[PDB]
Amino acid sequence: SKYQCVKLNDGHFMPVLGFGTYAPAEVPKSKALEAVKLAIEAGFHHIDSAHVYNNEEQVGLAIRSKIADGSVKREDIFYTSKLWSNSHRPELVRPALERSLKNLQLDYVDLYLIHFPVSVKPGEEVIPKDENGKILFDTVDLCATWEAMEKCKDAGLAKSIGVSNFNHRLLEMILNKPGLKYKPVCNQVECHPYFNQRKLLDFCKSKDIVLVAYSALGSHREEPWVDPNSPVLLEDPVLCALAKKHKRTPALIALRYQLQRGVVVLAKSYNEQRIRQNVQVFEFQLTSEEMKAIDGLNRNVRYLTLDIFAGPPNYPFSDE
Ligand SMILES: NC(=O)c1ccc[n+]([C@@H]2O[C@H](COP(=O)([O-])OP(=O)(O)OC[C@H]3O[C@@H](n4cnc5c(N)ncnc54)[C@H](OP(=O)(O)O)[C@@H]3O)[C@@H](O)[C@H]2O)c1
Numbered sequence: 001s002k003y004q005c006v007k008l009n010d011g012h013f014m015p016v017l018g019f020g021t022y023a024p025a026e027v028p029k030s031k032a033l034e035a036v037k038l039a040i041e042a043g044f045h046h047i048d049s050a051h052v053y054n055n056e057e058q059v060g061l062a063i064r065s066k067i068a069d070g071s072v073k074r075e076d077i078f079y080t081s082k083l084w085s086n087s088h089r090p091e092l093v094r095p096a097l098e099r100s101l102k103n104l105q106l107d108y109v110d111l112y113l114i115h116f117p118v119s120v121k122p123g124e125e126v127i128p129k130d131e132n133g134k135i136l137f138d139t140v141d142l143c144a145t146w147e148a149m150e151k152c153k154d155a156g157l158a159k160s161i162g163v164s165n166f167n168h169r170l171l172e173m174i175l176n177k178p179g180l181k182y183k184p185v186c187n188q189v190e191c192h193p194y195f196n197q198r199k200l201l202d203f204c205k206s207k208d209i210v211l212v213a214y215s216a217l218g219s220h221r222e223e224p225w226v227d228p229n230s231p232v233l234l235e236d237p238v239l240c241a242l243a244k245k246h247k248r249t250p251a252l253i254a255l256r257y258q259l260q261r262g263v264v265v266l267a268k269s270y271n272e273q274r275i276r277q278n279v280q281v282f283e284f285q286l287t288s289e290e291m292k293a294i295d296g297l298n299r300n301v302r303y304l305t306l307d308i309f310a311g312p313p314n315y316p317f318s319d320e
């Protein structure tokens, strides 16, 4: 083995390069199973999935298949799952995590997150709706939610807990919670050169919270979720230039950029050639001039605004 990891604030270790597993429904789930295997093989020791991804069955079957193989040991696979907004209510966390575990056929997750800050009505429908297309939000003290997460960490069902799509205010809320037992080990948020959340990153760094970047390569750009008019990240001029100078690719520089920033990156790809290519971030380095060059690409280009959840006071994206 031997791969690059970072020490999480709870003593655990997380690999710096994580493999994303979400894909549009237009893609069959089988693809997720075959893709993960290819990722394990390529060098990925960190796998990121979720309940809402509706692919834990395949993703688990994969990682479970590579352990049976003798290709990897469970202690070398860092699997992340996320609690979905229709289960923020206290008595609903553990059951949710248990449901995932059941679909994965694993005895615990290495990392478990609160997927999104705004709550929705409990029930099967992942995104409930009024007979008038209205999203049925719900109100839950996230601190109560976080208390159930802590009990999961203690029950040994989750090795490390953390948040996703949390902003400064929200992050603080958990941090300053009365009787907090475990500060979130990380905060997984969108983060690429056209939106290198310095402000948030610094904050996180100052609290020893690792920032896990997603859509680090510009995202899947799925029609309903991402604005087609947004600039295509991997087409950026200076990223392609640097790609050449280094004899690598714009994607690899977006990935390597993140790494040197002290960030943990996720790169999703079902294409074998590309999957194997992403594991190359470890093959080269960027110099201070380039380090700064990419810092300069900053813009306010947020790909996933998930504004269909814009209502509630917990919508994360309208502050920093
Ligand atoms: N917590 C959250 O709120 C949240 C939100 C969004 C995503 N995530 C996580 O982050 C992961 C990242 O997925 P994403 O859709 O956001 O964006 P991404 O990782 O930026 O990837 C978008 C696309 O880039 C392509 N790609 C990968 N490697 C490439 C390479 N070397 N050269 C050229 N293209 C390459 C992929 O196409 P191919 O697959 O065709 O290669 C991919 O569809 C997800 O799978 C998920 O696990 C978490």
Ligand SMILES: C[C@H](CCC(=O)O)[C@H]1CC[C@H]2[C@@H]3[C@@H](O)C[C@@H]4C[C@H](O)CC[C@]4(C)[C@H]3CC[C@]12C
Pocket: 022, 023, 024, 025, 050, 052, 053, 054, 126, 127, 225, 306
């Ligand atoms: C919350 C996340 C965004 C962030 C992330 O990826 O972490 C989004 C990304 C894709 C979305 C699903 C969509 O493809 C298919 C379907 C559409 C229905 O109208 C509602 C149900 C489904 C299953 C959506 C649920 C919400 C998902 C999982």
